[PDB]
Amino acid sequence: ELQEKLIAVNRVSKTVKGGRIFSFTALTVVGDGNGRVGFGYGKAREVPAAIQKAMEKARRNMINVALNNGTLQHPVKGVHTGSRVFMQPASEGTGIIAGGAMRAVLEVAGVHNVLAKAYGSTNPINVVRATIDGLENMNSPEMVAAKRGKSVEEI
Amino acid sequence: MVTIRLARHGAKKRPFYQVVVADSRNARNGRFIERVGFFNPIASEKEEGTRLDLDRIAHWVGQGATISDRVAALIKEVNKAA
């Protein structure tokens, strides 16, 4: 019922006394389509084995995101080691406007309308981390209402 | 020499003469004082193709402006038909 898709696959190497030892890495994102999204990173000698490992890694380490209506509550800015991510909620019907890694993360999470831009490095492993960081730190008016002790007359 | 004239606009074979008061030494489509109305020679017969601002024309004519022949014809036909 939940959706899963593969971000990128990369071949890595570890040289030994005999020579190189080739390996394959898989970055995947798993989301239920509501705002519960996670990512998994796995390593294996074979591409099917590597992608499978990332699949179970993503089912654990799931997070929850509070969405308004298929979109973000407010503009959000997610920063990881070398990647800067700016996402802001857009109007209905505008669709998803984001880079490769961010679009997959966003679409499996369940955000249909969003304007998202990536600054800094565009390494898939780090932009996915930055995107997850933004969806965390974004908040909901009811949790803010309890946070400030001011009820929900703000909106 | 202040005159109320027709400035030709619109595409070719479909004129959209533009009634405007202007100094007579300016170009036909050049600088003007103030737009007054329009006149559409196509005359589609489904919707009105002419609307003129008669009160501004009066403020100009009775002050010392001048009417061209076509604009004068427009004034008389608008009055008789409306």
Binding site: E92, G93, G95, I96, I97, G100 | -
Partner: protein, 205 residues
């Protein structure tokens, strides 16, 4: 400014029936659908994200017989209009005369619709039009010419109109070979095999 090459190569490339043929016969019997055109049509290589977006765009263009420049103008018109870009684009593609003539069934396909519209054999509100991509306003009446009334192909398409599923927003009178455009569709009547979302992000790269 049209397509003149083989018809079912288009239906083959996107792998689905594109209604280019009249439908008097089974499309499977007429041609092998599960194969792509060409000597490599045996293989089905892994198609990328850009590939699937392009295939969706080309699928819509080949259903409606519209070229790329025309279609890009429709998208800009769709994006300018208030509402949602995906079904706005689909709504313009419906209002073309080819589609409305074809959908009301005076032409077996858009190509008969194209001949009928472009050969001055279609009147709208009693006015003769021969432009394929003339938008149809709601409450407009499209009828066959009295000269064109006595041609075999038009009456032949009326039976195929029944053979397929009737459009709810078009009211036809085959007794005098006429039809009425009550209003535009709402994207709930149209086929769901068209993913209009991919179109927006193809043209919004």
């Amino acid at each position: 400014a049209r397509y003149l090459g083989p018809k079912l190569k288009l239906s083959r490339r996107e792998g689905t029936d594109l209604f280019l043929k009249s439908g008097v016969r089974a499309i499977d019997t007429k041609c092998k659908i599960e194969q792509a055109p060409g000597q490599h049509g045996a293989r089905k290589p892994r198609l990328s994200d850009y590939g699937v977006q392009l295939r969706e765009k080309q699928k819509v263009r080949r259903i409606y017989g519209v070229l790329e420049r025309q279609f890009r103008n429709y998208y800009k018109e769709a994006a300018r209009l208030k509402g949602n870009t995906g079904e706005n684009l689909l709504a313009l593609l419906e209002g073309r005369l080819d589609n409305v003539v074809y959908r009301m069934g005076f032409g077996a396909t858009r190509a008969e619709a194209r001949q009928l519209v472009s050969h001055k054999a279609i009147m709208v509100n009693g006015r003769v039009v021969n432009i394929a991509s003339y938008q149809v306003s709601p409450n407009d009446v499209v009828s066959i010419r009295e000269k064109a009334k006595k041609q075999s192909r038009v009456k032949a398409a009326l039976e195929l109109a029944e053979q397929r599923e009737k459009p709810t927003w078009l009211e036809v009178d085959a007794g005098k070979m006429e039809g009425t455009f009550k209003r535009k569709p709402e994207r709930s009547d149209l086929s769901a095999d068209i993913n209009e979302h991919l179109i927006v992000e193809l043209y919004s790269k």
